[PDB]
C-alpha cells in the first residue's frame, strides 16, 4: 500500500533516498507508467523493476584496524593496545551502530613522598630510615612504572625553646655540649622533588644526617601539612595516587603547643616554602590541627602513612583513628611490615570517553556496558575498574539531512587513554543513475524538479 515514499511527491532518486532509509528508487524505464518509482524495494521487486535499476544503498560499518587488545603494558613486543580504525558509510537520516572496547592495561601512576626526621633522637634509626627509603622505591618500581619519588625533612620549629641558642657557637653545632658535630636545625626543608630517578633519590637519602633540638616532640605535622598543601614544589601528579610516608620515633607537637614559643597565629594552611626549599613560616605559624590536616589530605587525596618505631606505635595507632584512612607500620631493620602497607595501598586502587571533531550533522548515542554485562544507555562513563577489567560501549551514529561534505572523520577517545578509534564517515546521498523528462529538452532536471525555459 501507499507509504511515506509514495505520498511525499518524490520526483527523483536523490529525493527518494533523502526522504527515508526505507525508500528505494527504480531507475528502470520498463516500469509501467503510473507505478511509484519511489517506494519500498520489496514493492519495487513486486513491481518487477530491474534490481540493477533499484538504487538502495545500505549503511555499513566496516572495520579498518582491529589489532588485538593487549594484556600487559610492559610487553616489549608490539605497541600497547587499550582501544583502532573504523569506517562508517551512512545514507541521509539513517543510523548505524558499532561496538568499542577499552581496557586498563597500563600500570597506575603512583606518587610516593618521603618524610624524614633529622633530629638527634634517631641517630640509632637513621640507617633504618635510609633502608626504608631505598626499599620503598625498590618495591614500587617492581609493581608500577610511572613512579615519582622524593623527600623532605623536618626537625622542629627554629625558635629559642627548641633551638640551642645558649652558646654563640652551638647554633651551627647543636651537639656542642657533648663535643660532637651535627647540622644546624631547621623547621622543614623540601630536598628532592618527585622524580622517576631512583639513583638520585637513593644518593640524596643516604647523604642525610641528624640535627639536635631540645624537647622530645618534633614538629612533623608542619612537615606533613606543607608537603600536602604544596603542589608545584612537591610535584604531585593530578592522575597518580598520592602517598606521603611519615617517619619519627618520639611524640609529636600538636596545635596550641606553639603558644609556649610565643607563636599564637593559627596554621594558615597555605604553601609557604620559598625559593630556598625551606619552610619560611616555621617561626610565625602554629602547628596545624588534626582537623585541618584531615581537610587538606582529603582535598588533595593524599594517603598519609605512619612508619614509626615500636615505642610510639600505639600512640600513632590511636592518632590514626582521628585521621581516617591512615595506617601505621613498624619501623625496624625488617621493613617488610611497612612495605606491606604500600603494597595494599597500591592494590586498593575510570573510563570516560570524549568525542573530538564530531561532525555537526552527526549525532551519537552512547550505550555503556561496564560490569556484569549490564547496559546503561545514555551514559559514557564506567567506574570501579581494576587491572584487566574490560568495558564496552555501543555507539550509534545518526546523520541529519545530508552534509555537503561527502567524507569527514572524527575520533572517540577515553580521557587520558591515548588509544582511540578514528572513525571515517562517508555519506551516500547521490544515486549511481544520477551520474528528456522536462518535456523533451524544455528545461533542466535538477533536484527532481524541471526548471522550464
Amino acid at each position: 500500500g501507499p507509504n511515506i515514499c509514495t505520498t511525499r511527491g518524490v520526483s527523483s532518486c536523490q529525493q527518494c533516498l533523502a526522504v527515508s532509509p526505507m525508500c528505494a528508487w527504480c531507475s528502470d524505464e520498463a516500469l509501467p507508467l503510473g507505478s511509484p518509482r519511489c517506494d519500498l524495494k520489496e514493492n519495487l521487486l513486486k513491481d518487477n523493476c530491474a534490481p540493477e535499476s533499484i538504487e538502495f544503498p545500505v549503511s555499513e560499518a566496516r572495520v579498518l584496524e582491529d589489532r588485538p587488545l593487549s594484556d600487559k603494558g610492559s610487553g616489549d613486543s608490539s605497541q600497547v593496545t587499550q582501544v583502532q580504525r573504523i569506517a562508517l558509510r551512512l545514507r541521509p537520516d539513517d543510523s548505524k551502530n558499532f561496538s568499542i572496547q577499552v581496557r586498563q592495561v597500563e600500570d597506575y601512576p603512583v606518587d610516593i613522598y618521603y618524610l624524614m626526621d633529622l633530629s638527634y633522637s634517631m641517630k640509632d634509626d637513621l640507617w633504618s630510615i635510609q633502608n626504608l627509603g631505598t626499599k620503598l622505591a625498590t618495591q614500587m618500581r617492581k609493581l608500577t612504572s610511572n613512579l615519582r619519588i622524593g623527600f623532605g625533612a623536618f626537625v622542629d620549629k627554629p625558635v629559642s625553646p627548641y633551638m640551642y641558642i645558649s652558646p654563640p657557637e652551638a647554633l651551627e653545632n647543636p651537639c656542642y655540649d657533648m663535643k660532637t658535630t651535627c647540622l644546624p636545625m631547621f623547621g622543614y626543608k623540601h630536598v628532592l622533588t618527585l622524580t622517576d630517578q631512583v639513583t638520585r633519590f637513593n644518593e640524596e637519602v643516604k647523604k642525610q644526617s641528624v640535627s639536635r633540638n631540645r624537647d622530645a616532640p618534633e614538629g612533623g605535622f608542619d612537615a606533613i601539612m606543607q608537603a600536602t598543601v604544596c603542589d608545584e614544589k612537591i610535584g604531585w601528579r593530578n592522575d597518580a595516587s598520592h602517598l606521603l610516608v611519615f617517619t619519627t620515633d618520639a611524640k609529636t607537637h600538636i596545635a596550641l603547643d606553639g603558644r609556649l614559643a610565643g607563636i599564637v597565629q593559627p596554621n594558615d594552611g597555605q604553601c609557604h616554602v620559598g625559593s630556598d626549599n625551606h619552610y619560611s613560616a616555621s617561626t610565625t605559624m602554629d602547628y596545624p590541627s588534626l582537623g585541618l590536616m584531615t581537610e587538606k589530605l582529603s582535598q588533595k587525596n593524599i594517603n598519609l602513612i605512619f612508619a614509626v618505631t615500636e615505642n610510639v606505635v600505639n600512640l600513632y595507632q590511636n592518632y590514626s583513628e582521628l585521621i581516617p584512612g591512615t595506617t601505621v607500620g613498624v619501623l625496624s631493620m625488617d621493613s617488610s611490615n611497612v612495605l606491606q602497607l604500600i603494597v595494599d595501598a597500591y592494590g586498593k586502587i575510570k573510563v570516560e570517553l570524549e568525542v573530538r571533531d564530531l561532525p555537526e550533522e552527526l549525532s551519537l548515542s552512547f550505550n555503556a556496558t561496564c560490569l556484569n554485562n549490564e547496559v546503561i544507555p545514555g551514559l559514557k562513563s564506567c567506574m570501579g575498574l581494576k587491572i584487566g577489567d574490560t568495558v564496552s560501549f555501543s555507539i550509534e551514529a545518526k546523520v541529519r539531512g545530508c552534509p555537503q561534505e561527502k567524507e569527514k572523520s572524527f575520533t572517540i577517545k577515553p580521557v587520558g587513554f591515548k588509544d582511540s578509534l578514528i572513525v571515517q564517515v562517508t555519506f551516500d546521498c547521490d544515486c549511481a543513475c544520477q551520474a528528456h523528462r522536462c518535456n523533451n529538452g524544455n528545461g533542466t532536471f535538477e533536484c527532481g524538479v524541471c526548471r522550464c525555459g
Binding site: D215, L256, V264, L290, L315, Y319
Partner: protein
C-alpha cells in the same frame, strides 16, 4: 549585655594589645581601671625592643590608656661586657591578674644568663606591684638550672590570686616540660625582695616535685584556677595539663594547704587539648565551686558521620560527697575553637545563679571571633546561650581572635551588674561590655464576663439612644528590678479586642469611647509592689457579623520606653529575657451559654417537568425549621441557575409563609436571600412557597439544579446540610 555602644581601646600596632585583660580596683581611690597586657609593645627600656607592656585604661575619663612603669631598667650585667638577663622579646603582659591594690604581670619568655655558666634559658619573671612599692618575683629562677630542673620553667604563663593573698603561678616547662605549680604569700614575696640577689628563696612556698620519666612534656601550669574543693575554706589549686595521658589532656586538683592530689579529670579525645583554659565558679548557686574546662580542638561526629572540630567545654558540678557531675557543651561552628577562653561573670542578670561566658575566637562570619553567654540554672547550666557577641574588625594581617581573652565579675559602671572586657589582640583592641538592668514585669489581664449575652442590652452607646451590651476588662502592670534604676518607668500599654480574623476581615468588639478594637495609652509605673491598674468598657457590634464560632480574644502588649529610662550614661534598661511580652485571653442558649441550633431543610416541587422552548413557571415548596436552640441572623439561601428568574414568594396561600426574600447576584452566584428570622426560636417550623421563571432553551441540559441551604451566624451547626433539587426537563 549592651552591644550597641561598648567601650573600645587600642594600642600600638602589632603590640598584641589585648592578649590578657583584667580589672584594677584600687582600694585607696574610688575609680576603677582596666589592665591590658601588650606582650610585644616597644618599651623605653635601654637597649630593649619588644619587651612587653601592661597598660592601665581609665574607662570613663576620655578613655586614655597608659602603661605601668613595672621596670624601666634594661638588661643587667653578670659581669662587665656580660649581660645577666635578656629582656628583649620577652612577653611582658602575657598574664595580668589583679586583686584590690596588687597588680601581678608576668613575662613567660624572659631569658637570663645562668650564674653557673653563660647560657640562655627562659625562666619567666613576674612583677608584683603594690600601692607604691614595686617588687620582682621569679620562683623558677633557681639553682635547679637546665631543662632537667627549672631552667625552662617559663613561670608566669598562667597566674591567679587566692582569697588569702596567695599567688598561684604555673610553669609549663619545668622538669623537662613536666610542668610545675608555685604558690607564695604576697607579704613574703614583698619582704624577701632583694635586687642584688637572683635566687631568692621563700620559706612558706608550696611546690610540685619531679615525677617519673613518664609524665614528661605534660604542660602542667598552662592554665590556673583557684576554688574551694575540700571544705576547709582554703582555695585549692586547679591547673590545666593539656598534654597528659598520651595527649588526652588532664586537669589537676591540688590541696590548697600542702599541695596534695585530690581529684583528676581524664579526657576522651587525644589532641583535643583538654585543659587549654579552666575556670572555677559555682554556677547553680549552692555555694560549691564548679569547674569549667575547655577543649577548643574537640572533634565530634558531624551530620554525615565525620569528625568536625568545633570545640567542647566540660562542666562538672561539685557535690558534698565529693563526686563531680559532668555535662558537656559542644561547639556550633567548625574550626571555631569553642572553649578557648572561659570567663566567669558572676550574677550577670542578678537571677540568683552565677553566669559565665565561653568564647570561640575563630568562629562567626569571616572568622572574626564570637562570644557565647550562658546563664545559671539549678542542677546544671543553661546549655542554650542567651546572647551572642561578635567581632567587629576584619583581619589586617592577623586573625582578630575576638574573645581569646575575657575578664568578668566586676562592676565598672557601679550599677549592681557585672561587666565584661574582651581582648582583640589580633587587631590589638579591647572592648568593655556594660551589663543592662534586668527588669521583670508581670502583667495581669482579667475579663469578668467570660461568657456574656448579647441580650444583656443594658449598656448605653454614647452619642445615640441605641442600647448595647458591654463588658469589663481589667489590666494591671507591676515592675520589679534590682540594681540602679529610675524610680518611674514610662510603660506603653497597647491592647486589641479581637485576635485571629486574619487579613482584617471583621472585628466585633469596640470600646465604649471612640469605638475601636485597639487602644493605646502611656502609663507610668513605680518600681515595687504597687500593682497599678486601669479598667475599660467595650461593647460588641447585633446583626453586623456572621462569625460567632471562634471565641473573642483579648490581647495586651507592653513596650518600655527605653530612651527615657536610661541613666546619665545612656545605658538603657532591659526587660526580662524569659518573660512573655504578650498575654492573650479568650472570651465567649442553655446553661453552656452557647446557642446551638439544629438546621434542616427539605424541598418539594409542584411541577416535576419543565418544557423546553417556553417560560415554565416553577413553584418551589421549602420546609425550613430549627431543631436546636436560637439561631441568630438565620437566612435562607437558594442558589438558582442562570436560566431561573425569581419572581416572588407565594402569598395567595395562607399555609405558606410570606417571607421577605431578596434576590442577590454576588460573584457570579445568583441567590435568593430569604429572611427566616433573627432569633429562629427553638421548635419553630417554617413552610413557604417560591415561584421561579425558567427560560430554559439549551438542548444539552437534562434537568435544572437548585441549591437551598439554611445559614446562620451561630456557634454550632450554623448551616444546614446542602440540599439539591433537580427538576427534569421535558420535551
Amino acid at each position: 549585655l549592651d552591644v550597641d555602644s561598648p567601650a573600645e581601646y587600642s594600642g600600638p600596632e602589632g603590640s598584641y594589645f589585648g592578649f590578657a585583660v583584667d580589672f584594677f580596683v584600687p582600694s585607696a581611690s574610688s575609680r576603677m581601671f582596666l589592665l591590658v597586657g601588650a606582650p610585644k609593645a616597644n618599651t623605653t627600656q635601654p637597649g630593649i625592643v619588644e619587651g612587653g607592656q601592661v597598660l592601665k585604661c581609665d574607662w570613663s575619663s576620655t578613655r586614655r590608656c597608659q602603661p605601668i612603669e613595672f621596670d624601666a631598667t634594661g638588661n643587667r650585667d653578670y659581669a662587665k661586657d656580660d649581660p645577666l638577663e635578656f629582656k628583649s622579646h620577652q612577653w611582658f603582659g602575657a598574664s595580668v591578674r589583679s586583686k584590690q591594690d596588687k597588680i601581678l604581670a608576668c613575662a613567660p619568655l624572659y631569658h637570663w644568663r645562668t650564674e653557673m655558666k653563660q647560657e640562655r634559658e627562659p625562666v619567666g619573671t613576674c612583677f608584683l606591684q603594690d600601692g607604691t612599692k614595686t617588687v620582682e618575683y621569679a620562683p623558677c629562677r633557681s639553682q635547679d638550672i637546665d631543662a632537667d630542673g627549672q631552667g625552662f620553667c617559663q613561670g608566669g604563663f598562667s597566674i591567679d590570686f587566692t582569697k588569702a593573698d596567695r599567688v598561684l603561678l604555673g610553669g609549663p616547662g619545668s622538669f623537662y616540660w613536666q610542668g610545675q605549680l608555685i604558690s607564695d604569700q604576697v607579704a613574703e614575696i614583698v619582704s624577701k625582695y632583694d635586687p642584688n640577689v637572683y635566687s631568692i628563696k621563700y620559706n612558706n612556698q608550696l611546690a610540685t616535685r619531679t615525677a617519673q620519666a613518664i609524665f614528661d612534656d605534660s604542660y602542667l601550669g598552662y592554665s590556673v584556677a583557684v576554688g574551694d574543693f575540700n571544705g576547709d575554706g582554703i582555695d585549692d589549686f586547679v591547673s590545666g595539663v593539656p598534654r597528659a595521658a598520651r595527649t588526652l589532656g588532664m586537669v589537676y586538683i591540688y590541696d590548697g594547704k600542702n599541695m596534695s592530689s585530690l581529684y583528676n579529670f581524664t579526657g576522651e579525645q587525644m589532641a583535643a587539648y583538654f585543659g587549654f583554659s579552666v575556670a572555677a565558679t559555682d554556677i547553680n548557686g549552692d555555694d560549691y565551686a564548679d569547674v569549667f574546662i575547655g577543649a577548643p580542638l574537640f572533634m565530634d561526629r558531624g551530620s554525615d558521620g565525620k569528625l568536625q572540630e568545633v570545640g567542647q567545654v566540660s562542666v562538672s558540678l561539685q557535690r558534698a560527697s565529693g563526686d563531680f557531675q559532668t555535662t558537656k557543651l559542644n561547639g556550633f561552628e567548625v574550626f571555631a575553637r569553642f572553649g578557648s577562653a572561659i570567663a566567669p561573670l558572676g550574677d550577670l542578670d542578678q537571677d540568683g545563679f552565677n553566669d559565665i561566658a565561653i568564647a570561640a575566637p575563630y568562629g562567626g562570619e569571616d572568622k572574626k571571633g564570637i562570644v557565647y553567654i550562658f546563664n545559671g540554672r539549678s542542677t546544671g547550666l543553661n546549655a542554650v546561650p542567651s546572647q551572642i557577641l561578635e567581632g567587629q574588625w576584619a583581619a589586617r594581617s592577623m586573625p582578630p581572635s575576638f574573645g581569646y581573652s575575657m575578664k568578668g565579675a566586676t562592676d565598672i559602671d557601679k550599677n549592681g551588674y557585672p561587666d565584661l572586657i574582651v581582648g582583640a589582640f589580633g587587631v590589638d583592641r579591647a572592648i568593655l561590655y556594660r551589663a543592662r538592668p534586668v527588669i521583670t514585669v508581670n502583667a495581669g489581664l482579667e475579663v469578668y464576663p467570660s461568657i456574656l449575652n448579647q441580650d444583656n442590652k443594658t449598656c448605653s452607646l454614647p452619642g445615640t439612644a441605641l442600647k448595647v451590651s458591654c463588658f469589663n476588662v481589667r489590666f494591671c502592670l507591676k515592675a520589679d528590678g534590682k540594681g540602679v534604676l529610675p524610680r518611674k518607668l514610662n510603660f506603653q500599654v497597647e491592647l486589641l479586642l479581637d485576635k485571629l480574623k486574619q487579613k482584617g476581615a471583621i472585628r466585633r468588639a469596640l470600646f465604649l469611647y471612640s469605638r475601636s478594637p485597639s487602644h493605646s495609652k502611656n502609663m507610668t509605673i513605680s518600681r515595687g509592689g504597687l500593682m497599678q491598674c486601669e479598667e475599660l468598657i467595650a461593647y460588641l457590634r447585633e446583626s453586623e457579623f456572621r462569625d460567632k464560632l471562634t471565641p473573642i480574644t483579648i490581647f495586651m502588649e507592653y513596650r518600655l520606653d527605653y530612651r527615657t529610662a536610661a541613666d546619665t550614661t545612656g545605658l538603657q534598661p532591659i526587660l526580662n529575657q524569659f518573660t512573655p511580652a504578650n498575654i492573650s485571653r479568650q472570651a465567649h442558649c442553655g446553661e453552656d451559654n452557647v446557642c446551638k441550633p439544629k438546621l434542616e431543610v427539605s424541598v418539594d416541587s409542584d411541577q416535576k417537568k419543565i418544557y423546553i422552548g417556553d417560560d415554565n413557571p416553577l413553584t418551589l415548596i421549602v420546609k425550613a425549621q430549627n431543631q436546636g436552640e436560637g439561631a441568630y441572623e438565620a437566612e435562607l439561601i437558594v442558589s438558582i441557575p442562570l436560566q431561573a428568574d425569581f419572581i416572588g414568594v407565594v402569598r395567595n396561600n395562607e399555609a405558606l409563609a410570606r417571607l421577605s426574600c431578596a434576590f442577590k447576584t454576588e460573584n457570579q452566584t445568583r441567590q435568593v436571600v430569604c429572611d427566616l428570622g433573627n432569633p429562629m426560636k427553638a421548635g419553630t417550623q417554617l413552610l413557604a412557597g417560591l415561584r421561579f421563571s425558567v427560560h430554559q432553551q439549551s438542548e444539552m441540559d437534562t434537568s435544572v439544579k437548585f441549591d437551598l441551604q439554611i445559614q446562620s451566624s451561630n456557634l454550632f451547626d450554623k448551616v444546614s446540610p446542602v440540599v439539591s433539587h433537580k427538576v427534569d426537563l421535558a420535551v
